Design a binder for this molecule. Structure first.
Ligand SMILES: CC(=O)N1CC2(CCC2)c2c(F)cccc21
Ligand SMILES: *[C@@H]1O[C@H](CO)[C@@H](O)[C@H](O)[C@H]1NC(C)=O
Length: 360
């Protein structure tokens, strides 16, 4: 189990002003630290945030958080479940800011909600330094879904923070799971008039203003004022990043398909939708061509790294825990024989890879 710690700096809050926090399981004698960012969509205006507060309140408030959580997948401490980093110091950072981990805005007379995702990460790192993180050799900032995009938005800021605090020896790396989205054409198009019809580009554009969202500096300088939404799209922000980032992305991610207005039921897929889906997988594969550390199976699914059976999926015969281990070796101070780090499926239809999650 990982034990809850509410932030000692109570100015760093979840959406409703309750303190943010983190769950921690220490591993004495390990200098590896895994900080995992939870996902869970986002909200971008008063109405849709109010709705989220009614029925997804744990994503907006710490008032009902349990005092412990069980580490699963890459957060498991059992080598049977986590071949990669079972002995690491484990941190699970709950997502309670609804801002894709980008916000830097407090609740105030002008703001019904606080959007502090970027500051929560910084404050967790700061408070962990006194709990052993000061001795770390590697800090892996990982995350799934909105948390995976949060890795892309925050990994270099964590690196800068540690450098400015006087810890230049801690190697900061990112692991972005299911947070690599395409600003592609939707299969069916709706004008952004409400929440359900608003495409991610426009919803993120509105969110950034509502959250006071922040993006990595080099990406911000490329796209400039009013265009920072571009930095929420992995293929655009990734080339601007300096920290090593391993990208995990299903080629047919269910959240990507949802925002594309694709809803697979059971009837035969006809030609237009068949071509749409195949083109989506091809475009995703294309965006990963120059990403040297990546794991992209041809499956219709969503998230991987904290699932208990995350070890099952393989690309070209290599599992994700193995690929991550090979990534670790590649970052020791030329490719490795039989230890690949770039694993992208080439087959063109969901479940053409036999190791895809069953959905059972
Ligand atoms: C499914 C999808 O296109 N997006 C867009 C975005 C903004 C760039 C990543 C996102 C999140 F930040 C969290 C959940 C879904 C999504
Ligand atoms: C608490 O966090 C805020 C926001 O990041 C920061 O401005 C402030 O200095 C912090 N307070 C302390 C005592 O560290």
């Amino acid at each position: 189990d990982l034990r809850l710690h509410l932030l000692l700096n109570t100015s760093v809050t979840c959406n409703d002003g309750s303190p943010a926090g983190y769950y921690l399981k220490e591993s004495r004698g390990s200098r590896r630290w895994l900080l995992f960012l939870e996902g869970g969509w986002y909200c971008f205006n008063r109405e849709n945030c109010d709705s989220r507060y009614d029925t997804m309140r744990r994503l907006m408030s710490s008032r009902d958080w349990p005092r412990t959580r069980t580490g699963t997948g890459i957060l498991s401490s059992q080598p049977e479940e986590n071949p990669y980093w079972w002995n690491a110091n484990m941190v699970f950072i709950p997502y309670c800011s609804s801002d894709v981990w980008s916000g830097a805005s407090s609740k105030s007379e002008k703001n019904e909600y606080a959007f502090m995702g970027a500051l929560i990460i910084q404050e967790v790192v700061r408070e962990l330094l006194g709990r052993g993180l000061s001795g770390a050799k590697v800090l892996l900032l990982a995350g799934s879904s909105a948390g995976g995009t949060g890795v892309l938005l925050n990994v270099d800021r964590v690196a800068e923070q540690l450098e400015k605090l006087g810890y230049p020896a801690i190697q900061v790396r990112g692991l972005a799971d299911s947070g690599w989205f395409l600003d592609n054409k939707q299969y069916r198009h709706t004008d952004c008039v409400d929440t359900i019809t608003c495409a991610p580009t426009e919803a993120i554009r509105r969110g950034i203003r509502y959250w006071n969202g922040v993006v990595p500096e080099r990406c911000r300088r490329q796209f400039q004022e009013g265009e920072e939404w571009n930095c929420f799209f992995g293929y655009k922000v990734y080339p601007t990043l300096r920290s090593p980032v391993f990208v995990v992305q299903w080629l047919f991610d269910e959240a990507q398909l949802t925002v594309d207005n694709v809803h697979l039921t059971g009837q035969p897929v006809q030609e237009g939708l068949r071509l749409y889906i195949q083109n989506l997988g091809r475009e995703l594969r294309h965006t990963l061509k120059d990403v040297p550390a990546s794991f992209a199976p041809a499956c219709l699914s969503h998230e991987i790294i904290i699932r208990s059976h995350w070890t099952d999926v393989q690309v070209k015969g290599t599992s994700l825990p193995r690929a991550l281990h090979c990534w670790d070796r590649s970052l020791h101070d030329t490719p490795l024989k039989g230890c690949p780090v770039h694993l992208v499926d080439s087959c063109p239809w969901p479940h053409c890879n036999p190791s895809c999650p069953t959905g059972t």
